[PDB]
Design a protein around this ligand. Structure first.
Ligand code: MG
Ligand code: MG
Ligand code: MG
Ligand code: MG
Lengths: 158, 159
C-alpha cells in the first residue's frame, strides 16, 4: 500500500476487490457442498456464477481507462472471512446449525463487498470514469440482492 | 476453538464475537479521529465512538435479559484485521483528503461487518424468542446502517 492520490487509492482498492472475488470463487464450491439445505447450496452456486460475471466486469473496467492497471496482491480481509467460513464447516455437523452459521459467514463476505463496491463507485464518479461507474453499480446492486437473498434463507432456515 | 451444536450456541458465539469487535473498535476510534485533518470526519469518528459505547451497553442488557445467554471471552479476528487496515492507511498516507477517502473506506468495511453481524443476531434472536434482545439488536442495527450512510455522505463530500 503506497498511495498518494485518489487515482492510486482507486487502483489499490480495485486490485484488492479483484483479489477478493478470485478468492471467493475458489471457496464457493466447498461452501455449496458443505450445506445440507439444497436451496442454500444452489444460492452458493448461483452466487459463484454471478461472481464470475463480476470479475469479468473488473476486466472491462481495466480496459475502459488508461492508467487503470491492477496490482497483484492478496486481499487479506477476504482471506480471513473465507477461513472463518471454513472453520464453521470444521466445527459443525452437516445440519441446520451449520447452515445458519454458513449464511452468517457469507453475509459478512457480501457486506465486505458491499462496502468495497460502494467506495469504488464513489471514487470512479470522482475520477470521471463513466463506464467503470456504470459497471461498479451493476455489481453493487447484485451484491445487495445476494445479501437480501441470504437473509430470506436465514429467516426461512426455521 | 468454536463449538456450535445448537442455534443457542451459535447465537452466543456470534454475540461474543460482536462484543469483542465493538470493544476493539472503541480502542481504535480515538486514533482514527486524530488521524484526519477534516473536522467533519473527525467529528463523525468521535460520534461513532460514543454510539459504540451505547451499543456495548445494549449487549450487556441483552446478556442480562435471558438466562443461558452467557458471553465467552474471545478475540474477533476479522475486526482485528479491519482495524489493522485502517492503521496501515494512516502510516501509508499523508494527512490529507486522500487519507480521508481511505479512512472512510476502511471504516465502512468495519460498519458493514457489523451490519452483517447484527442482522444475523436479530434473525437468531427472533427465532429463539428473545424478545428483549430482538428490540435491542434491531436498534443497534438501525444505528449501524445510519452510520454507514453518514460515512457515504462524507465519502461523496470529499470531492
Ligand atoms: Mg462480488
Ligand atoms: Mg459476493
Ligand atoms: Mg457497533
Ligand atoms: Mg460500528
Amino acid at each position: 500500500m503506497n498511495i498518494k492520490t485518489v487515482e492510486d487509492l482507486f487502483i489499490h482498492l480495485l486490485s484488492d476487490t479483484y483479489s477478493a472475488e478470485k478468492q471467493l470463487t475458489k471457496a464457493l464450491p466447498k461452501l455449496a457442498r458443505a450445506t445440507s439445505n439444497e436451496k442454500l447450496s444452489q444460492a452458493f452456486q448461483s452466487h459463484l456464477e454471478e461472481t464470475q460475471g463480476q470479475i469479468e466486469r473488473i476486466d472491462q473496467i481495466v480496459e475502459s481507462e488508461s492508467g487503470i492497471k491492477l496490482k497483484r496482491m492478496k486481499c487479506v480481509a477476504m482471506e480471513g472471512l473465507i477461513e472463518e467460513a471454513n472453520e464453521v464447516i470444521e466445527s459443525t455437523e452437516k445440519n441446520e446449525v451449520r447452515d445458519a452459521a454458513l449464511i452468517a459467514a457469507a453475509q459478512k463476505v457480501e457486506h465486505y463487498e458491499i462496502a468495497s463496491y460502494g467506495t469504488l463507485a464513489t471514487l470512479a464518479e470522482q475520477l470521471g470514469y463513466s463506464k467503470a461507474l456504470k459497471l461498479l453499480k451493476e455489481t453493487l446492486d447484485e451484491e445487495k440482492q445476494t445479501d437480501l437473498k441470504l437473509t430470506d434463507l436465514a429467516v426461512s432456515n426455521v
